[model samples]
Target: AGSAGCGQPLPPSQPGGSSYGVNFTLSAGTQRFYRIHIPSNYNVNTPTPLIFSFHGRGKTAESQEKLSQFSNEDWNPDAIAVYPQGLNKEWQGDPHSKDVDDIAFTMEMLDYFQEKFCIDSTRVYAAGKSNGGGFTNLLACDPTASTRIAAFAPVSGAYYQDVSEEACHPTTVPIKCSPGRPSIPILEFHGTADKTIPYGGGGRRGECLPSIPHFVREWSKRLGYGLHNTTKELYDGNVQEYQYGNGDNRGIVTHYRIGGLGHDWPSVRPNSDNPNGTYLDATPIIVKFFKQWVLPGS
Candidate 1:
């Protein structure tokens, strides 16, 4: 560890690029771990952006890196990244059950990384799929977490009871704003044909999560966004993007309504493998979105 940074120990990554699986014991004495991806171009003296890519329920950190492709050079090289593991292969989005204090764990890691690594505190971001996505929203709802996270991209996320532990709600529920004013920028991507979390509502003829459009509308209204400004763009052919408020900052509420797709991340666009090239791929788009957001420094 060096003396230039804060109090956390600097475990030192390789000069250029490195990957590490780090673990820390929480106050409950439970051990939790996360994987870090530092690019080959990393320089200890330079502050780099960081991305926290969380996995869906029943998925692991390693799988999330591959699934989200955020760690790939196509998305990174200019950023430091991590994928944290959740307890019981699931996040505690529901308040009814006893769950791990993931919020504390996450905050602790942020403090550690900000202190130990060459992190640009302003450029931190979080993205996730399914349960992880909902958990990201849960974090966004918190006044403290909202200030810490620059932006959030929740894929196929549910707003609270929108999706429960056991089964998909067969019908859509009304979107309600969480307590405390929410102003954190959010981009949500959901598939229209998703039955796991249906678009038009109803998974098995009973209850379902709010449709993607409903989620977007509720969020935009609750956040007091779209009061005087709006940006509309048709993306990747059929994907519709409606942005509200925030002016050139990509709006406070951004939604990617991916039609005909079902419960899946948007695949890479054809001919998208070039390092110098860009695509409408979900990961790449997410990267672009995250780059535009940054925490306000005190």
Candidate 2:
């Protein structure tokens, strides 16, 4: 028999813990899986924040669970974390030539999750790594899909080449290219030594990709943001962070440049496995930033 729909209530896995799994049917006769995590103290009477995390190519929702350690209660207490598996083990817009409609899938997933859970509408956010990161950019460019997402974080990914020139407009109303969709805040993290997607603008095997500077400049021009200030700091022994943002109450283009790192996530624990020899734990810092800023409307 097929798995239960996202609307179905799930049996409690832990004493007082709120967690559930559902298989969502997408286009092309495909099924995208997702897991939702709610804290033990969750109260259905009150709404909670939501975060949508996407995995990289060749990664699974379980792997992302292990990597992110979402069950730990150190992060936000009143938030629900949702991890969605990509279609066919790869995200749309990936260089591997997957033809699935990821944007539509994401919109459907968000709509389903919001309806099923008591989600805090204004504080919604999305994050991902590598190809998943690229897809996050695609989601950010989406107006109807991202209308509810308050902020986005893309790690080790670039702006989609197909939409870079026109700045990823899914609507026909000629969305203002400058201050590119100021409603949703963006936080981008990339490694300078990333050989997978080079620091500067270039094609990977003739497939166009936006460089870090190209993305920053484009968004900066679109958002009417200036190079207001920058801060540099060390995260782990091998990872460094560079932050750039403008605007008094709301930051326009906040970026993190991971120095001396390659294609990997930021490390959290020192003895933790460094998959690809460059991965660092970005969850802590990402949550910190998210907590500091409230969604514009909220």
Candidate 3:
């Protein structure tokens, strides 16, 4: 396809289609690549929302796409999924860890995609699993990224490089909005039985980090919702959901802590052995969460 309003030329394309992946070097001269899932029903005549989904450690962008099933019609056939490659298949957020500037790469991808495609910039979103999920947490706190993202959903994620629970406190991380910007919408999913990075929070300083409950509580405070108020509910049989804020920001800090699950996307597969005796498929819930909030102006 040719440029819509984009002044530059377009990236390589698949014959007779808009679906394609391209390798574009970053400012550091690193060989970077990402897959662009142009919705099958994409209408060049209008703008559409974009989802910058990242992959976990040891996993490639291609693999993450399939694992999350993000491109499937059942999940979100309307939005675009920009899956990118991570240096060593792992993103960096810790002082001791060495990975490419994923945050920079993400910003660049946004500029390029917005230029070539009819992207609804205000409706942009991000999500990931495990290590990728950790990176998402990092972005959620980044000043520059906070302004760019409309909403965020991190599955089986935690704040990378977090200190131990003993000395940890809920820290306020601001998004990109200006002083007195309206509330931000955040949704998260974590399993209580996770072992790689236990749901209760524990691992190495530069490796693993805090627990789900801790992350939710801390993030709620950041969203301007302190510890005192907020509603809590149990859904999907045994999954515990905590809601904060009110209206758009009321559920601003919503979370799902699956009782019996492990460090896995709620695949809805056979998991009669779980602690809660349920298989929580998070795909639908995540899709719904993202759809709940559009850009403040939109």
Q: Model 3: which residue pairs collide?
A: 146-176, 147-176, 201-211, 244-250, 245-250, 246-250, 260-275
Worst 10 residues of 3 by lDDT: 171-180
Best by TM-score: 3
Give the poorly placed runs of model 1, Cα more than 4 Å off: 1-18, 94-97, 162-182, 201-208, 223-237, 246-250, 269-279
* Candidate 1: clashing pairs of residues: 16-40, 169-207, 169-208, 170-202, 170-206, 170-207, 170-208, 171-207, 171-208
lDDT (0-100) at residue 163 of candidate 2? 38
Error of 2 at 277 (Å): 7.6
lDDT per residue (tens digit) for residues 12-101 in model 2: 452135446678897566777887787766655455666778787788776766665555567656567777888667787775646788
Q: What is the lDDT of residue 99 in candidate 3?
A: 54
Ranked by lDDT, top first = 1, 3, 2
* lDDT by residue for model 1 (1-298), tens: 1213433334754333445788888776888999988766766677778888888777788877777787788666687778999887777673332557787888888887777777777788898887788778877876677777788899877555544434653234654445343456788888777766676544432334555666776666655633444545565466677787643444667887776766666665422112322225678778888877676554
The positional error of residue 150 in candidate 2, measured at the CA in angstroms, is 0.5
Tens-place lDDT digits, model 3, residues 1-298: 2224334333445312434678888777887899878777766656778887778777788877776767776678788787888877788664344756888999888887777777777778888887787777777777777677778888887465444445443333212222124466678888777876677665555344665777777666655524334545566457777787743455777888787677777776543223233455676777788888776752
Q: What C-alpha lDDT values do all the predictions have?
A: 0.69, 0.64, 0.69
Clash pairs (backbone) in predicted model 2: 178-222, 179-222, 179-223, 180-222, 265-280, 266-280, 266-281, 267-280, 267-281, 268-281
